[PDB]
Amino acid sequence: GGDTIFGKIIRKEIPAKIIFEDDRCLAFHDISPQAPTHFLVIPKKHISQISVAEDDDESLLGHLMIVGKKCAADLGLNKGYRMVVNEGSDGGQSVYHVHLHVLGGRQMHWPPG
Amino acid sequence: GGDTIFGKIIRKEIPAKIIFEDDRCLAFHDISPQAPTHFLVIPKKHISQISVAEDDDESLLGHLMIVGKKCAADLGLNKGYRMVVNEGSDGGQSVYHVHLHVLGGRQMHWPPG
């Protein structure tokens, strides 16, 4: 679902190193990692951005985080990690399809950008 | 919701600049802001860190994101913002009580720390 790149990855038109997939989301590695381990977890349902997510979208949004921490553990991120969700211009949302990033493998700093 | 300074805030034992509150979560401004608007949304339930969230906390975790989006709206963050969850040492988690940071009011940069 979607007119973005994520649309293409979800419809399997273009490869992605999939880490996990199920009926509701997809987790794969980011091709421009900002850290040793850097993947995204995306809902298969198209939600352009968190600012427009519906109340009925909370279980789906919570699933994205649950999946992210499971993936983070399988990837051996036993020292910690950071999850980020960007919204619009100020947040730096590049692709307008909701996506959670998980970064780890290195010490993350403060502020988070 | 426990022994951290976030538990004291939930029990109304120490003051906080409370933004919103319902039966399962609380949103308040960060006492050490890294952006013009910087707040936290936390569960009343004491979950020490995202890595030990149970599968049942799923909608609760999604609910923290929905509440964050709604708060962002009422704080005037129309140009976007960044949502962040920190896990452990490498993630830079400063309190062992699950919390979602929402930052906006300025251009956020990449990488996210």
Handedness of CA A43, A45, A51, A53 (dihedral sign): negative
Check B92 against A79: CB less than 8 A apart: no
For residue A13, give how far its alpha carbon lies from the nearest alpha carbon of chain B (Å): 28
The C-alpha atoms of residue B36 and residue A9 are separated, in whole angstroms, by 36
**CATH number for the domain running over B1-113:** 3.30.428.10
Q: Do B83 and A88 lie within an 8 Å CB cutoff?
A: no
**Å resolution of this model?**
2.0
Find out whether B64 and B41 touch, Cβ atoms under 8 Å. yes
Q: Which two tokens stand for residue B60?
A: 């609760």
Domains of chain B, by residue range, sit at 1-113
Determine which one of A29, A38, A63, A99 is catalytic: A99
Q: Among all chains, which residue has been given the structure tokens 């339930």?
A: B45
Q: Cβ(A12)–Cβ(A75) under 8 Å?
A: no
Residue of chain A minimizing CA distance to B59: A59
- A74 is written with which tokens? 């399988």
Specify whether B29 is catalytic. Answer: no
Structural tokens at position A75? 């990837």
ω into B111 cis (within 30 of 0): yes
